[PDB]
Amino acid sequence: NLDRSNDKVYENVTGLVKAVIEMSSKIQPAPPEEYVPMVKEVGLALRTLLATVDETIPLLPASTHREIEMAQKLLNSDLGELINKMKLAQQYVMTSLQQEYKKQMLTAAHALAVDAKNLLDVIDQARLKMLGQTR
């Protein structure tokens, strides 16, 4: 119901989600020299999203602000948890425990994606309350 043609928030949340998805789908058959740069991708995507959000806050109801900020905070946290796991799977490279730590990357990542999506919903709301939509 909201025109997206010039909605970066959306556009960026979409990138972040894709980054995750493509990483989580290429993860199992892959080596560290392949999944680290993938994770870096997620980061860059997350970073870009966050900046965009920052500039958007100044144009949304002071009310919402707090939540959006909290939501932002989570996203960062998530990425970290991901990076930690990535380091782990990186350590136990060719071993009996690699394919197991990778599954933890998967979980971390998926969380990131879910929260990224919620950030969108929170902001989508601000946008609607601001544009003055009915009940």
For residue 121, what are the CA distances in angstroms to 16, 62, 108, 115?
A: 15, 17, 20, 10
Query: Which CATH number do you get for residue 19?
Result: 1.20.5.540
Structure tokens at 38: 């993938």
Look at the alpha carbons of 12, 121, 54, 87 in this order and tell me if their dihedral is positive or negative.
negative
Structural contact between residues 86 and 39, judged by C-beta atoms closer than 8 angstroms: yes
CA distance 104 to 35: 13
Label each residue of the chain as H, E or C.
CCCCCCCHHHHHHHHHHHHHHHHHHHCCCCCHHHHHHHHHHHHHHHHHHHHHHHHHHHHCCHHHHHHHHHHHHHHHHHHHHHHHHHHHHHHCCCCCCHHHHHHHHHHHHHHHHHHHHHHHHHHHHHHHHHHCCCC
Greatest CA span in the chain, whole angstroms? 58
The experimental technique behind this entry is X-ray
Contact 120, 13 (CB under 8 A): yes
Structurally, how many domains does the chain consist of? 2
- Which residue's structure tokens are 């997620």? 42
Resolution in angstroms, to 1 decimal, for this deposition? Answer: 2.9
Sign of CA dihedral 38, 40, 43, 48: negative
> Is the same domain home to 67 and 112?
yes
Say yes or no: 132 and 107 in one domain: yes
Domain of residue 130, residue span:
31-135
Residue 119 shares a structural domain with residue 63: yes
Q: How far apart are CA 119 and CA 74, in angstroms?
A: 9
From the list 113, 102, 2, 123, the residue with the least C-alpha distance to 52 is 123
CATH number of the domain where residue 121 is located = 1.20.120.330
